[PDB]
Symmetry: D2
């Protein structure tokens, strides 16, 4: 699926609706980013700028002007067309095609922005700007306001009020539209197919990075060229490290592998984690920890719905985990006292959920301790895990284990929808899948 | 293959040999680099810092101190160990293991660099620093020199002389050692296998990005996780655009596809371009242009040797190209006058060769118009191409064609060695390869 | 006279009255300023910071917090006491004496401002800050807002709204209180005594700078140590240059001298200009131009009152000047057409009036073309002048003449009060004064 | 006296003599400096730039180019002429008159410096630049070097070596020429006349600032418009504060007043301190401390000559002071042990001497603990003092006293010459002077 022109227009108007009359909102594009020397990383548009434009060029600025409660218009600054620059550094939209292509009223050359922007802000009361987001943007905005401030003899005046649009825009991004949900739904499928494939390909002797290659290939073949985040393939003791991206080790018969990978599809992130035996057969000890993480996920998926919160559901997960660990002798004592002592923390130190959207760790206000009441349209991850360090003082068989199972959900009128359930997580279903693949 | 500890030591001493007595060289690591929000691109170490250390962390600084012509020592600043930071943002070397792991004399915490660096520079005559390379580095170095300058009452003195080490270091990087050549030799094989695979997989109806996925998979499976540069898959008229990386189009029966992709293997870049029919069968018109580019490459590979230069060989290529284009009626007139008129330029506007190494467009001095005499150990690309715009005023059958064929070579005592010849480029061999694959 | 503690408190409350509830206003002190090497200029406090504090130290910040419509409090950041620093760079107020001395609620060390300021802004909706006023201030404020923005997990939130307090504060400064008027009244007397003295001392053969010395001495002896602006003593052709401060020439019998000097008394600027014959006797040609400037000033002093504007009075001055110049043959033609042609501009190119206060060119909004209706409490200069260039195409006797006569006034309920009329300006009174002095 | 054109040329050549062949030296002018709002401090040229040019404008850059050991030339960047700018912000030299006026070969507009400077540095090996001296200069120089670095395809190359010219230039400034000595000799006379006048004018009831006014007037009347540093008039307990510049107190019968004031004459600083009874009659206790400071000064003036050092002479002063204080009972014990205990430090905590020149605290290397052997041509202050705090644990009669006596000297072939001896310092001569004045 995709995001429509009409949808981009709706979002702009939605922002304008909340703006004060006599104001302008300034949204800047991301800079290009060096990888080494004259070589650059693949371009990634700023998420907020993308959200309002679906325009994948740098050196661009969207300006939304609200004259009053019924009058408003849009100006885009963007790079000019140029036969030289394009033949080299690749084709450009230019000013002519931009109004029609991107549904803006006017389009001006970025190279003129210092000559033109102050004229657009002259006489307004308010400017909305995300200060500190980019250095080049702050320089342009501050330069425009100084010309207005020092220009009373030329009848110029600066807006005295600057407001951060991020709280407003991020509150919008927090609630996904039907179109957005459809896109994320497809990101979930693509990402899941990748994890299914990783499970099917995995053999002892393969290196962790080989599963990374299989996943990225799968993303690509469905049209999601880039991952939403750096892929994790943590086998054995590497599963205990949360930001493990080296993915440099041989995968050994007997170990578990934790794979956290997500595609980026039309800008929107998938985010799945599956953990499984490298040899296709869970051991007793591996099952004992896996079952606790899986019950945490399965209960959380039953619970998540409008009315509850991440905090509340996290409470139930803590309970499930402390009980499970007490039964294994990894913790000793009363469950309720241990909870109050937060005794689960050496083993479960991540949160259960984060917002998901144009960024994998998406924008939006969580509330104190993530107490915010959930409403339909919110999209989030459910990702319980247990991480027992190699030197943890616990029975030997649990040492050096890292297990996480992560699914992506959307809150609905009566519950939630699981976007990533098409890749399996029940242990019998994992072993069946891997067995089935190993006859080929 | 790999780069040894001993080799890293040799390079450091080689630099020290050329430094003035009573001097210190400051080499800084690359900053981490944001992709979107809290998510980061895969880390890419600065090439020069990497060259002297094989150390893949940010917030690190190599300091090489020359007391005199026989006394010198090395200090490394690097991130301290930290159970918190690592469990999250991934394992760190720390100060204890660093001397032995990386062959430096001393290792100090990066968080102490402002308290310690000025003490290392006190009383020296010369500091070698690459000014403007990184903002954070300039701030550290300038801060260290100001403390020394303003500290005469505490018997401190700053070195009065600052020298850019880049000309010196880049002249070293220009000449590859046996180990480096072995690594690049393997980068060439990996990259070539990827291009062979792309040719074998290509069918009409596949999208350009599908061949990108096949190539990146092949890089990965041989242990080259990342490309050295953003992959180009330019089919049809997209072949006319030199920085085409969108790779977003359906590949059509009848069109050519130009694939320029390279792996990064132990830091060193492969760089191959092959152009071929999407349907496995060159047309007369496609053959007519391809044959001119291929003769240019084949002649260049015969010519490149110690004693000649990129400029001189480029001269012979211009000749080959103008003659070929005159025979097709794409140019009219006397070959020699047309050459003097530079009449080939609308169609051949890139250079023939660039240095290759830790950067795809490698460091090192070219000489005026690339006139520098070649010597053994230099590594470079040979990449003639013809690009006929869709609206070029030439016979219709040549319009909208882009063809490049690129190989990587090293200059040897008596000629050159072709690192990328294991992927085919003779047209009959391309058609045979694709035919053979199409029975499967 | 002086400014009371109570008055400083009133101004703070007056600002607070206009602030939004749940807001904080940040007012920064001026940096110290190098003259050459380790030597500094005499310290000049930022005028706005001074206005609210009467505190003459750098590295100080006034923070006014409005909790709601009845609750507000003040925090001062200032330099800590230190026996070392003071014995050297001079005594300091410190935190203990500050609340009581300066009428603030709380006082904290400036060296703690980055550890404390963000805590004062946490949870507010609005911060009032003068962006771009000082680099060090912007760094402190931006640093405080980033900690709040990135600190949601520690339950911090930044104010989303930033407002420039300068329009508000400068509108306050535009209207002087009884105390302020009394201070300016005394600045006027001091400044005038200085000009009277200059006239009495002036002889041919003295250098322009000698009159500067006489003026600065007079300022000093009445307790106004520093001038409000760099003194102008433009004799002969130097009178034609508006920013003449070299004051390096011998004063010649036959020439006029234009003296523009003002004291700074308790922070408030005097600003007087008197022009007079170096030899104490006006010539016919000097009188002819002087009489036009003086009638302009005398008419302006009759006119200035509540209800009119600088623009309107400037209109009447233009009329007076064009008529005067036509009668001398310096302009030819119809007065009304010449006015419309703005034909007076080569000779009268300054404005007639500027606001006067803590800055000689004081803050406050003028309106388009200075059309703002005057109200009681506004303080301003009246300074018509004629400047005929040495090469002006006019009768020889008028070439190379510069004449200005400037007085300071305050608008009152029924007119204006002249603060500087105690130094003479009628030509007969100037000649009498100089004659009287020349018998001594 | 003054500094000649020829002398400015000599200094430039002297610098060039020491420069490497194939190099350029970049010397920048001082920025203009705000006092409050649109008002500026009196302009003070950077001392080093002044030293080579005698040119008193901002936005100017001297560039000295050494082609080889016999070829060199000078380029000046300066502000262009402009009838508008000058009529307002005052006359300018421009490019036409500059070569001849200031003895440079070529002169270009400052507004072109970014278009022209890199062309002057292209192909040189060395650039001499004072990094960190001014922000605007670093921006210009770094911008010029980046164009050269990134411009190999346009056959540009940057100098790889940057050297600080300050050690070289400051070593030149350390040794004064005959002309410089003549100028300083006159600065000494002017400054001394000012101090004599202060002594003659001083009466109880006058404020400290009144003596400041008398001194500044005297400076001015001899053509030294500005002081070299902020004047100190510390009466009573204010004498104990070294950086006392408030000068705000009533001078009381019975107290001493310490006056430290210096003129700036043709750029060169005078620096004299005299301390004397406000009522013209020293008391026993005042005499007891004064006599120790005066013997320190008189012995130092006998001692200072080529061959000795500030450190060595400071040794003899410490001896004189500890003995004097022991005889008064302000210190108890063995003189030699007390010296070794540095027991004099609570009372004598300043140094004895600093270099004097274009800056009051002049440039030049002191050596460790100021051990540098003195040579003819060095100019320095001799300024012993005793400062007994109001709460010092000493006999009551010595509490709250500050006494310093400072003279300026030049080292000669056989000793020194005292530039400031024309103002008196023997106590009987002070009392005679004040008595004589008090009959008038
Ligand atoms: Mg185990
Ligand atoms: Mg065609
Ligand atoms: Mg005349
Ligand atoms: Mg006493
Ligand atoms: Mn994840
Ligand atoms: Mn997640
Ligand atoms: Mn290539
Ligand atoms: Mn290439
Ligand atoms: Mn004035
Ligand atoms: Mn004025
Ligand atoms: Mn002094
Ligand atoms: Mn001194």
């Amino acid at each position: 699926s995709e995001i429509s022109r009409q949808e981009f227009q709706r979002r702009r108007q939605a922002l304008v609706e909340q703006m004060q009359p006599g104001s302008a909102a300034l949204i800047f594009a991301a800079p290009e980013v060096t990888r080494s020397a004259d070589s650059e990383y693949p371009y990634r548009q700023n998420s907020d700028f993308w959200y309002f434009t679906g325009f994948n060029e740098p050196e661009a600025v969207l300006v939304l002007i609200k004259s009053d409660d019924t009058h408003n218009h849009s100006v885009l600054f963007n790079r000019v067309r140029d036969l030289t620059a394009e033949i080299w550094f690749g084709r450009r939209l230019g000013q002519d095609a931009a109004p029609e292509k991107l549904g803006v009223d006017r389009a001006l050359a970025f190279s003129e922005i210092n000559q033109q922007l102050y004229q657009l802000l002259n006489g307004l009361d308010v400017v909305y700007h995300a200060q500190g987001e980019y250095a080049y943007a702050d320089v342009i905005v501050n330069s425009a306001l100084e010309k207005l401030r020092k220009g009373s003899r030329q009848n110029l005046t600066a807006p005295a009020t600057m407001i951060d649009w991020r709280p407003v825009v991020h509150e919008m991004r927090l609630f996904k539209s039907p179109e957005e949900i459809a896109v994320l739904r497809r990101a979930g499928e693509i990402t899941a197919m990748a994890h299914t494939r990783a499970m099917e390909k995995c053999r002892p002797g393969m290196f962790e990075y080989h599963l990374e290659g299989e996943i990225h290939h799968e993303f690509n073949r469905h049209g999601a060229r880039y991952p939403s985040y750096n892929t994790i393939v943590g086998s054995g003791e590497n599963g205990c490290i949360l930001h493990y991206t080296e993915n440099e080790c041989e995968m050994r018969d007997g170990d578990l592998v934790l794979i956290d990978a997500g595609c980026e599809y039309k800008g929107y992130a998938g985010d799945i984690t599956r953990t499984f035996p490298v040899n296709g057969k869970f051991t007793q000890a591996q099952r004992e920890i896996y079952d606790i993480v899986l019950e945490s996920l399965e209960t959380s998926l039953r619970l998540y719905r409008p009315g509850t919160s991440i905090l509340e559901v996290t409470g139930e997960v803590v309970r499930i985990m402390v009980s499970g660990l007490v039964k294994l002798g990894i913790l000793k004592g009363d469950v309720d006292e241990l909870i109050a002592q937060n005794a689960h923390r050496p083993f479960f130190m991540a949160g259960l959920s984060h917002w998901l959207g144009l960024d994998v760790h998406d924008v939006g206000v969580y509330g104190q301790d993530r107490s915010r009441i959930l409403e339909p349209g919110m999209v989030l991850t459910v990702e319980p895990g247990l991480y027992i360090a190699p030197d943890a003082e616990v029975p030997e068989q649990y040492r050096g284990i890292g297990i996480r199972i992560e699914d992506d959900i959307v809150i609905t009128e009566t519950g939630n929808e699981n976007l990533t359930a098409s890749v399996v997580k029940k242990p019998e279903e994992i072993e069946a899948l891997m067995v089935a693949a190993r006859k080929q």
